[PDB]
């Protein structure tokens, strides 16, 4: 719930004797304004979740989600835009859950500490693929008392090469190889009983990229505060450092949040944002919002386009 | 309903006190014959409608529709043909309904006066984008007594330009601009009590394009008559003028219709069609039909291909 | 059931008085290992089946199925991969069922004699388009006692040619023609009473391609054996010949299969496979499996890549 931009659970269309199917997703209208110029960023999601009990401590699972968009640019055009965001199957029970296929890595729940806005935020906490969301990957999650644990491992992708090792078509190949894109990620979160305090940390590595994250949060009644720190290498000796702060509170159905994000890549500031929004929940599956991002990049460095502020206006319906 | 080619409403997959989800669409097999040569024009549609009541005079809505086709050309090929026809969210109530995202403009309900065939017709009533269906657009509709009103406004699309004003990548851009494709549309329909007589009119404008339409219809017992006139400019001094006539009758099940369509572009005849069909309704969601279009373009002007007649045969199943 | 890799029936989401809609499909995680190198071959399917009774011996039908995949190659990429596998509508009753749109030809049920593995097999029984699955085709099937009959006919696809006879765009064309890809297929299967013996055979022809198939099987309690032979022409005078053997055994919740596959194209061996697998059914709609294919091609001929063994590991959830 606090991660406002994230998916909500869908609803049952059939069920019987331990086995069910839920359909979910959203229709979200989004208008973006930059320098008084408008862009349509609306999006639809559809998803399907199947779950089958094997016994009282064992079950199977299957999941798909797709995203659909348009880009007319002034004509009634044909729009062939599709993104298969999740494709996996898995097994779970007392020991937790394990899946294969495109699914989330371990660091998402860490970045969730400060990723609480409806449209903006989450600009200074980059995640590498194995830590984020990618296929050819085994993914695990589990909960033991007040400790939550996630982990993932990704295989390098098979390819085909000629005698010298250049990537080529499979018909013209001398042998199989791989792209060296194997990797792993790991994260842990401890909840201190009640009192509202959470702490979390994580690490990830893939090819010549690596990173770690530290985070903490306090939640009390209608108030919330959190902080997050990210540090690693994107390649070479290229350093990345990110800071995020977030605060939010609720008044009736209205939720209000603000974040500060600051990122540094190769010893220059690549992101510097203060953003604010307001979201009104008419119903659990119907909401409206408005958001503004103050861009603090220079404009002598960087440039005019990349230093522009942004206004966003949204209307979101959820299927469930 | 009289507009036979249009969508029918889908059916509920879950509900729970003012909130529902409906799934709909069609599987429509269509064979096209020209000069004794056959083409498969079959199509599938799937759509999802969510609706949530906020109160006795207020609700929210979200909608998506996609269309799916194949084009094998003699091989068992992979077919990645998708069209996202609708993507919008909106709010409605006592005063009517307003939406944002790709949805219909105002002139469709006007062209519906003569658009009554299962396959042919609707060839001499061109609609510009704001009047037809397009994104980055606010759309409104309402009904008050015997008066129906529709309206829409579309924003110009943001783009990025270099110092010289050339459209370029955002990374290579000196500033933001737009494509000048803003516009609007408006239409009204009046019903003369219970007399079966209807009149309608509309207007639309976008960049160097504009148009207006006038229409009238009469319905009595098992008979229907209608006329439609379209006039405007597609650009420069490129004039467009369109005339359509339609008549139909019903006998038990199976419906019979005929239309005449005639269009003139740049002071030359660009469309000239007389068409007849028969459609048999086995069930409300299962029908068959057959249609023939007499092409009356010359062949000395125009050409042999563009002056050919067409036979069409269809079988349509609707999901509900 | 015996054709393990094939679809299972979906489940009802709504129904009323003879008319229903079923949603089905799968989420299937699949890991492929060749030369110690891993490839993600996971896939999702979604399908929608509508059926409406007209009377005690007459009904209508509409069907769609799509397949969805990812190919990240180490990045969190956008994946626009869709395949519309089926798009058809049809009518059926006492005499059987007839459809138009992309659907199956007649020879699939013949290749089903030995196509019983979860992942491998079915490598030496090539089917031409009209016999396989393709659009612009009328398809018929029926069952009368122990006789199953299937047939199909496909039209050539309309195209457009210039004065010189070259395929060109419709605006630049002198006339309509076609690609000469018309054809037909035919097949039959008899069950020899309650003896466990089945015999089947089929034939197909399209443009300059043709083929026939012969098959037989014996099924008794928890044992199964079958054989299949394929012979025809792929073009001009270039020959194709295929041989398949299959065996299977069942123990409680557990299936075990093995197949031998051998094909010859243009008087050279193009396929040579011995494969074995094991599949465990936790629930009717949740299973796991592991499979190994011994590749028997030479390696001096053909090459190293095309002669590699393969290990496969799978986890399959079915939507119903
Ligand atoms: C995200 C804003 C920070 C407020 C955190 C306080 C703890 C409650 O957060 C739950 C997520 O809020 C969902 C908003 O839904 C509004 C429903 O109001 C019910 C409680 O007033
Ligand atoms: C439907 C094409 C126009 C034919 C004239 C119809 C005007 C007469 O009023 C009948 C109105 O019903 C229109 C519905 O048509 C759909 C077919 O439904 C037949 C099932 O009974
Ligand atoms: C499927 C190939 C395995 C060879 C043994 C089958 C011979 C006996 O047939 C018995 C009927 O079962 C056929 C369907 O099996 C599908 C999986 O069912 C497992 C759930 O009980
Ligand atoms: C999977 C290895 C488990 C290591 C976790 C050790 C438990 C105490 C540390 C968890 C709390 C998070 N933090 C930030 C304090 O490290
Ligand atoms: C006391 C200042 C609180 C700053 C954080 C508030 C979050 C942003 C709220 C959006 C603007 C609405 N407002 C002004 C009522 O807070
Ligand atoms: C709590 C937010 C902390 C953000 C402060 C981090 C400052 C980054 C310093 C980099 C300055 C850029 N440079 C290269 C000119 O030094
Ligand atoms: C929690 C502190 C956040 C403060 C937000 C202040 C926004 C700064 C905008 C600058 C414009 C103000 N002014 C007066 C210069 O126009
Ligand atoms: C009174 C007949 C004059 C035509 C009426 C207009 C409807 C034409 C429908 C075409 C159907 C062909 N049919 C069966 C009527 O001959
Ligand atoms: C029932 C409506 C009939 C509309 C037909 C209009 C005919 C105009 C086309 C004539 C040829 C154009 N022009 C002006 C060059 O002669
Ligand atoms: C009430 C009759 C309307 C239903 C029309 C159904 C037509 C079936 C198609 C038959 C094809 C005949 N044809 C075109 C080959 O001559
Ligand atoms: C043209 C030959 C007629 C078809 C042969 C009929 C098959 C024999 C009938 C066996 C009946 C079996 N069963 C289970 C379907 O009832
Ligand atoms: C023909 C299928 C395999 C069993 C062979 C039995 C021979 C009977 C052939 C006559 C029936 C032909 N058929 C089924 C197309 O009607
Ligand atoms: C008792 C015979 C059972 C044969 C089936 C064995 C399947 C191999 C195990 C694959 C499952 C891998 N994993 C971890 C995803 O479950």
Question: What is the secondary structure of A190-226 as a DSSP string?
Answer: EE-SSSSEEEEEEEEEETTEEEEEEEEEEEETTEEEE
Dihedral angle sign, alpha carbons of residues B105, B110, B111, B117? positive
Instruction: Verify whether the Cβ–Cβ distance A76 to B13 is below 8 Å.
Output: no
CA atoms of B62 and B80, how far apart (whole Å): 26
Q: Do A207 and C82 touch (CB under 8 A)?
A: no
Partners of C118 in the beta sheet? Answer: none
The 10 Å Cβ neighbour count of residue A270 is 17
* φ and ψ at residue B111, rounded to 5 degrees: -65, -20
Q: Which residue has the tokens 């990620």?
A: A185
C-chain CB neighbours of A60 within 8 Å are 282-283, 286, 315, 317
CB A10 within 8 A of CB A25: yes
Q: Are B264 and B243 contacting, i.e. CB atoms less than 8 angstroms apart?
A: no
Question: What is the residue whose two structure tokens read 């148009």?
Answer: B211
Q: For A284, which DSSP code?
A: T
* H or E segment and range at residue B188: strand B183-191
Residue B276, exposed/middle/buried by CB under 10 A (0-12, 13-18, 19+)? middle
CB C99 within 8 A of CB C64: no
- Distance from C-alpha of B128 to C-alpha of B106, rounded to nearest angstrom: 11
Q: B87 and A68: CB-CB below 8 Å? A: yes
- Is C76 within 8 Å of A134 (Cβ atoms)? yes
**Number of domain units in chain A:** 1
- Do residues C63 and C38 lie in contact, with contact meaning Cβ atoms separated by under 8 Å? no
Q: Kindly give the distance from the C-alpha atom of residue C146 to the centroid of ligand 11, in angstroms, as a whole number.
A: 4
Closest CA to C187 of C145, C134, C137, C151: C151
Q: Is C145 helix (H, G, I), strand (E, B) or coil?
A: coil
Alpha-carbon distance B140 to B135, whole Å?
A: 14
Residues of A in contact with C68 (CB under 8 A): 64, 66, 84, 87
Please give the DSSP secondary-structure letter assigned to residue A132.
Answer: S
**Among candidates A97, A132, A100, which has minimal Cα distance to A204?**
A132
Q: Give the closest residue to B245 by CA, choosing from B230, B258, B231, B260.
A: B260
- Supply B218's token pair: 């009469």
Report chain C residues whose CB lies below 8 A from the CB of B84.
none
Question: Chain C residue with minimal CA distance to B26?
Answer: C62
d(CA B112, CA B150): 14
DSSP state of C305: G
> Which technique was used to obtain these atomic coordinates?
X-ray
Q: Give the residue carrying structure tokens 């051998």.
A: C262
| 8 Å CB contact between C53 and C19 | yes
Of A245, A262, A300, best ligand 6 pocket probe by most atoms within 8 Å of the beta carbon: A262
Surface-to-core class of residue C46, CB atoms within 10 Å of its CB (0-12 exposed, 13-18 middle, 19+ buried):
buried
Structure tokens at C204: 């197909």
- Rounded Cα distance between C17 and B263, Å, is 46
Beta carbons of B100 and A42 less than 8 Å apart: yes
Ligand closest to A309 (CA) is: 7
Residue B211 sits at the vertex; the CA angle it makes with B205 and B217, to the nearest 5 degrees, is: 130
Q: Decide: residue B220, CB within 10 A, 0-12 exposed, 13-18 middle, 19+ buried.
A: exposed
In angstroms, this model's resolution equals 2.2
Distance (Å, whole) CA C243 – CA C222: 24
Q: Are A279 and A251 in contact (CB under 8 A)?
A: no
Residues contacting C156, CB < 8 A, separation 6+? B37, B38, C178, C179, C180, C181, C182
Residue for token pair 């011996």: C57
| Secondary structure (H, E, C), C217-284 | EEEECCEEEEEEEEEEEEECCEEEEEEEEEEEEECCCCEEEEEEEEEEECCEEEEEEEEEEEEEEEEC
Q: Could you list the residue range(s) of the whole structural domain that residue A74 is in?
A: 1-320
A131 CB contacts (<8 Å, ≥6 apart)? A105, A106, A107, A108, A152, A185, A202, A204, A206, A211
Cα separation, C174 vs B37, in Å, equals: 15
**Cβ neighbours of residue C111 closer than 8 Å, sequence gap 6 or more:** C122, C125, C127, C213, C228
Length of chain C: 320
Which sign does the torsion angle of CA B70, B73, B74, B80 carry? negative
Q: Which of B18, B53, B62 should we substitute to test contact with A (largest number of A Cβ atoms within 10 Å)?
A: B62
Task: Collapse the DSSP code of A172 into the 3-class scheme (helix H, G, I; strand E, B; otherwise coil) and give the result.
Answer: helix
- The vertex-A211 CA angle with A208 and A215, nearest 5°, equals 175
Quote the distance between the C-alpha of residue C93 and its chain's center.
25
Alpha helix (H) residue ranges in B76-129: 108-111
Residues of B in contact with A68 (CB under 8 A): 64, 66, 84, 87
Beta-ladder partners of B71: none
Kindly give the distance from the C-alpha atom of residue A273 to the centroid of ligand 7, in angstroms, as a whole number: 13
Give the H/E segment covering residue C279: strand C268-283
Among candidates B244, B19, B232, which has minimal Cα distance to B130? Answer: B232
Question: How far apart (Å, rounded) are the C-alpha atoms in residues A55 and B27?
Answer: 40
Element (H, E) at A149: strand A147-154
Task: Give the number of other Cβ atoms within 10 Å of residue A231's Cβ.
Answer: 15
Q: Tell me how crowded residue A58 is: count the other CB atoms within 10 A of its CB.
A: 14
What is the C-alpha separation between B320 and C7, in angstroms, rounded?
A: 24
C319:A135 CB<8 A? no
> Tokens at residue B228, please?
């439609």
Dihedral in degrees, nearest 10, Cα atoms B132, B135, B138, B144:
30
Torsion angle, CA of B71/B77/B78/B80, rounded to 10 degrees?
Answer: -10
In angstroms, what is the C-alpha Rg of chain C?
Answer: 22
Report whether residue B281 contacts ligand 2, using a CB cutoff of 6 Å.
yes
Three-state SS at B301: coil
| Neighbour tally for C8: CB within 10 Å | 15
Nearest 5°: CA angle at B170, between B169 and B174? 105
CB C174 within 8 A of CB C149: no
Beta strand pairing call for C286-295 and C268-283:
antiparallel
By three-state DSSP, how is residue A307 classified? Answer: helix
d(CA A113, CA A148): 14
For residue C129, the SS3 value is helix
Identify which of B65, B72, B27 has the alpha carbon closest to the alpha carbon of residue B46: B65
Name beta bridge partners: A269. A264
3-state secondary structure at position B44: strand
Q: Are A311 and A32 in contact (CB under 8 A)?
A: yes
Residue B13 and residue C141: Cα distance in Å, rounded? 32
Residue C240 near residue C107 (C-beta atoms within 8 A): no
Cβ proximity of A263 and A269 under 8 Å: yes
Neighbouring-strand partners of residue B84: B66
């Amino acid at each position: 719930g606090i991660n406002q931009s994230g998916d909500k659970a869908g609803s049952t269309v059939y069920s019987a004797k331990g086995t069910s199917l839920e359909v979910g997703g959203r229709a979200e209208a989004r208008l973006s304004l930059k320098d008084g110029k408008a862009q349509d960023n609306s999006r639809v999601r559809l998803n399907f979740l199947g779950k089958a009990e094997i016994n009282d401590s064992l079950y199977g699972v299957g999941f798909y989600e797709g995203e659909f968009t348009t880009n007319d640019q002034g004509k009634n055009a044909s729009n062939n835009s599709l993104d298969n965001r999740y494709t996996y199957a898995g097994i779970g029970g007392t020991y937790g859950e394990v899946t294969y296929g495109k699914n989330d890595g371990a660091l998402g729940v860490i970045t969730d500490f400060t990723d609480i806005m409806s449209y903006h935020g989450n600009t200074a906490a980059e995640k590498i693929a194995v830590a984020d969301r990618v296929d050819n990957m085994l993914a695990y999650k589990g909960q033991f008392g007040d400790l939550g644990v996630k982990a993932s491992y990704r295989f390098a992708d098979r390819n085909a090469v000629d005698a010298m090792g250049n990537v080529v078509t499979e018909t013209n190949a001398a042998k199989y190889s791989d792209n060296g894109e194997d990797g792993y990620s790991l994260s842990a979160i401890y909840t201190f009983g009640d009192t509202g305090f959470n702490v979390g940390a994580g690490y990830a590595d893939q090819d010549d990229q690596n990173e770690y994250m530290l985070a903490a949060s306090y939640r009390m009644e209608n108030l919330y505060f959190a902080g997050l720190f990210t540090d690693g290498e994107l390649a070479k000796d290229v350093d990345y450092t990110g800071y995020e702060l977030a605060a939010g509170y609720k008044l009736g159905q209205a939720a209000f949040t603000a974040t500060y994000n600051n990122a540094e890549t190769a010893k220059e500031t690549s992101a510097d944002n203060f953003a604010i929004d307001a979201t009104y929940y008419f119903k659990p599956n119907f909401r409206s919002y408005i958001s503004y991002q103050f861009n603090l990049l220079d404009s002598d460095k960087v440039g005019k386009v990349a230093s522009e502020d942004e206004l966003a206006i949204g209307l979101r319906y959820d299927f469930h």
